[PDB]
Design an enzyme around this catalytic site. Structure first.
Site, PDB file in Angstrom:
ATOM      1  N   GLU A   1      -2.209 -39.214   4.957  1.00  0.00           N
ATOM      2  CA  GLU A   1      -3.276 -39.760   4.108  1.00  0.00           C
ATOM      3  C   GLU A   1      -4.158 -40.761   4.838  1.00  0.00           C
ATOM      4  O   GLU A   1      -4.576 -41.768   4.262  1.00  0.00           O
ATOM      5  CB  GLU A   1      -2.720 -40.343   2.843  1.00  0.00           C
ATOM      6  CG  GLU A   1      -2.036 -39.299   1.957  1.00  0.00           C
ATOM      7  CD  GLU A   1      -1.274 -39.883   0.803  1.00  0.00           C
ATOM      8  OE1 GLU A   1      -1.439 -41.093   0.504  1.00  0.00           O
ATOM      9  OE2 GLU A   1      -0.453 -39.163   0.153  1.00  0.00           O
TER      10      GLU A   1
ATOM     11  N   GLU B   1       2.018 -33.087  -0.569  1.00  0.00           N
ATOM     12  CA  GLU B   1       2.461 -33.913  -1.700  1.00  0.00           C
ATOM     13  C   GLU B   1       1.717 -33.487  -2.943  1.00  0.00           C
ATOM     14  O   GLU B   1       0.524 -33.139  -2.844  1.00  0.00           O
ATOM     15  CB  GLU B   1       2.180 -35.395  -1.556  1.00  0.00           C
ATOM     16  CG  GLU B   1       2.893 -36.094  -0.448  1.00  0.00           C
ATOM     17  CD  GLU B   1       2.725 -37.597  -0.457  1.00  0.00           C
ATOM     18  OE1 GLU B   1       2.289 -38.186  -1.459  1.00  0.00           O
ATOM     19  OE2 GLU B   1       2.983 -38.215   0.617  1.00  0.00           O
TER      20      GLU B   1
END
Ligand SMILES: *[C@@H]1O[C@H](CO)[C@@H](O)[C@H](O)[C@H]1NC(C)=O
Ligand SMILES: [Mg+2]
Ligand SMILES: [Mg+2]
Ligand code: NA
Ligand code: NA
Length: 330
Positions: free
Chosen positions: A177, A274
């Protein structure tokens, strides 16, 4: 546009296990979707297989992939974990155990402030208690920050080497991320991120001869401008998206799948690394694997659960979905 995926991973002379794992991913990509679940590392030994065990009992099958995190392996005040025999091998042992059953360990690392001034991985723009650790300094040879990251990398490499020597291969999803800038490793932008990736890739693959890793680059969200963050085709095996839809929304996220195909020119397998609610299994948006986060993101709670019992029963019995019972054994 055609897909154009390499049949070998980026690591030269990959381990037998990494060869097998990568080939399994290439061969099943676009035909089946690999089920996964994250677990919570920390001081709770019973929790270490909570989510897979729930899935076995409730939906009839364990996920093929289990998620593990090195977050407590280093950091200020984390001695209770990394110096306790009950926990210092928790990640290695969880990965070994799942691999030995024929499953896929998917490792990440919420990497706590390498300076040890704080215990935080969150950045000053995250809205959370933050570290000031400066990625731009960390990638310059001979700074205090550079020394600090190399010390931590050695610790994690020691763990990955334990896995290598046991014949275990893993999905390795570092520096994840980054584009959100909410973690220190992406907080300074793409330039530092790519330089960090190279430092870690070279240290692990070349210096430490960790040939057992399948490298997962997390491309979003946010995805805008991600091409400038990409470490390159020679340093990445899989593109992963971390997409948290509205709670209860099992949309397939087709558009993000398509963007990952387009942006990376069809050269890499695309996965949902995710999620909250799991994307409905659908060969029009055939995520290589999916991995809901731990606790309530997997095990349902309340009247609008992320992934209901009914959803899991359906998903884990789908002919499109690979569970632990479908794995060949490594
Ligand atoms: C396919 O990928 C390889 C490796 O990245 C590259 O050499 C080639 O230019 C790509 N495109 C096509 C059409 O093969
Ligand atoms: Mg390059
Ligand atoms: Mg459909
Ligand atoms: Na986005
Ligand atoms: Na439910």
């Amino acid at each position: 546009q055609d897909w154009n995926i390499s049949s070998s991973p980026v690591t030269p002379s990959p381990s037998a296990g990494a060869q097998k794992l990568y080939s399994f991913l290439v061969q099943n990509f676009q035909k089946k979707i690999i089920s996964g679940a994250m677990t919570l590392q920390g001081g709770d030994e019973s929790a270490q297989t909570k989510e897979p065990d729930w899935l076995q009992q409730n939906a009839g099958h364990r996920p093929a992939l289990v998620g593990l995190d090195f977050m407590f392996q280093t950091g200020k005040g984390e001695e209770w974990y990394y110096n306790d025999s009950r926990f210092s091998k928790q990640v290695v042992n969880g990965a070994k155990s799942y691999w030995q059953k024929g499953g896929i360990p998917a490792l990440c690392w919420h990497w706590r402030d390498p300076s040890k001034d704080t215990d935080a991985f969150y950045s000053p723009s995250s809205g959370n208690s933050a570290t000031q650790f400066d990625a731009d300094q960390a990638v310059k040879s001979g700074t205090a920050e550079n020394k600090a990251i190399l010390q931590d990398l050695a610790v994690i490499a020691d763990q990955l080497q334990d896995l290598r020597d046991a014949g275990v291969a893993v999905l390795w999803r570092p520096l994840h991320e980054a584009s959100g800038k909410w973690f220190w490793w992406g907080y300074k932008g793409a330039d530092a991120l790519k330089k960090l990736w190279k430092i870690e890739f070279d240290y692990f693959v070349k210096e430490r001869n960790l040939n057992n890793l399948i490298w997962v680059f997390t491309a979003g969200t946010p995805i805008e401008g991600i091409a400038d963050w990409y470490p390159g085709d020679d340093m990445v095996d899989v593109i992963g998206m971390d997409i948290y839809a509205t709670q209860g929304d099992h949309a397939t996220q087709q558009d993000y799948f398509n963007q990952c195909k387009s942006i990376f020119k069809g050269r890499k397998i695309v996965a949902m690394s995710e999620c909250g609610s799991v994307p409905e299994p659908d060969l029009a948006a055939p995520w290589s694997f999916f991995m809901p986060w731990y606790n309530n993101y997997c095990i349902p709670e309340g009247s609008n659960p992320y992934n209901s019992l009914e959803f899991w029963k359906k998903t884990m019995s789908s002919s499109l979905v690979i569970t632990l019972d479908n794995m060949p054994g490594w």
